Amino acid sequence: SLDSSPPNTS
């Protein structure tokens, strides 16, 4: 239920 990738914010 958790993302393997970090929150991409660009």
Partner 1 sequence: LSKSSWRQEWLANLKLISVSLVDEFPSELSDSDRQIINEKMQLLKDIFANNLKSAISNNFRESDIIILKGEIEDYPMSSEIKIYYNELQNKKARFWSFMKTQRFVSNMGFDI
Catalog residues that contact partner 1 under the rule CB under 8 A: 2-7, 9
C-beta atoms surrounding 6 within 10 Å: 6
CA gap 4, 6 in Å, rounded: 7
Distance of closest approach, residue 3 Cβ to partner 1, in angstroms: 7
Distance of closest approach, residue 9 Cβ to partner 1, in angstroms: 6
For residue 7 the two structure tokens come to 């929150």
Distance of closest approach, residue 1 Cβ to partner 1, in angstroms: 10
